[PDB]
Design a protein around this ligand. Sequence first.
Ligand SMILES: [Cl-]
Ligand SMILES: [Cl-]
Lengths: 9, 9, 236, 236
Amino acid sequence: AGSIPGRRS
Amino acid sequence: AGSIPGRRS
Amino acid sequence: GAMGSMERASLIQKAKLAEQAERYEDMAAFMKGAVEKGEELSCEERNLLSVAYKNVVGGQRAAWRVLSSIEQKSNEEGSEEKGPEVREYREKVETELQGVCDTVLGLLDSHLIKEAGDAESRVFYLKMKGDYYRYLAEVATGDDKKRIIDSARSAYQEAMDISKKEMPPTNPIRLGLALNFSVFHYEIANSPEEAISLAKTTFDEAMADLHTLSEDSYKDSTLIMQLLRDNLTLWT
Amino acid sequence: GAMGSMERASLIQKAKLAEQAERYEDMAAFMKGAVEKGEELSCEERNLLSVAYKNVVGGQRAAWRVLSSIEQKSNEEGSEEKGPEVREYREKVETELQGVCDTVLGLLDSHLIKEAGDAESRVFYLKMKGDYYRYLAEVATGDDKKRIIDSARSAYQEAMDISKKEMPPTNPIRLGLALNFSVFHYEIANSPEEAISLAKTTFDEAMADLHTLSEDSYKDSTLIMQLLRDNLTLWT
Ligand SMILES: [Cl-]
Ligand SMILES: [Cl-]
């Protein structure tokens, strides 16, 4: 189950 | 040009 | 902070360089220094702060899961005592993860959230607060795990209330908040029905608002809508 | 060292756990602590030491190349002065890389190499010495770049002399040494003909010795032979 990846701006 | 990767034992 | 002698603009510039070099611990330290200058953060600067710490804690969470899995195998029937090393090392990573989460929560509390008045900034910071309490909850076991879960829920809930009042249903911040709150419900709060209902209602209300968007905004919103759909596919 | 209070066996166990968790900075610190116990290292322990620091310096080299590329673009005709930030940050990463290389070289010098009598251990450490001087040479520009290159060449050369006397041409340590020495010739020493000749002679002499090997040894040797072939394909 994925949260916002948000590791690249 | 590649050296020995050697990043996994 | 070691960053007190560096210009705010230089800290931001170096955070961007660290992202390009995939040096996320540096990036987080630069953005921490920028926050401690005391000025509010722009939309771009908020993203830099979030990307930096998400990568740092992301590596710690991944390592904690590897070590926790090894530790649980070692404590099974027919297992061979390997010594305290696996537990000790899992504890070390866990303590380091909790320190990073506490640092982020400290920045939000001193004083990003109280100075955030616009919906875009306030929802962003409150979503962050819920996220980093959620990461604390993932490793919590003691007297305070219930209080940590409630702290995550309370931050997410305030953020949700603001976003429903102040943002359209396709707003990417609103969509990503609902996505992560739904993951909180499923993975942390043992409320999979709440998770599925939130993801479904969020997706459907965004779908009905897509006709208002430009081509670029449409791409931004449908990307996150797909993440909601991916979770619903996994959960049902 | 912070590892002085931990058992040698526990340091080794934690280094293996750190590798599984992809925590290579931890792994390097654990293996540094193990070396400083003063006992010689086993074949497996030498590999752990090498894997740990190769990953640490590998991330630093990758970041240094990203930053060096940005810095060189900023110093072109028609470029806009961005301030000292890119140079300052490249220097920071460069200094951190040099510190890691110095730490490894210090471990080899105090006292891994002088206590290494068997060909397998001595060639391994001398190859490491050549490698980490090579990494120093990649970023060197000042009064000592020639001396750094000569230090790399001297370590590689001693290792080559021993391996040709004491190991079969298919020995994986001997093959990997020749591979990296050939990369040294091509990338550092401006001797591409020496690089091609070494890779070709190494490959051909290994090919003629493969008939002596078991299925498992054959797989180990042909894997590195392919790396030699890949370089020859790129260089010719
Ligand atoms: Cl530990
Ligand atoms: Cl810097």
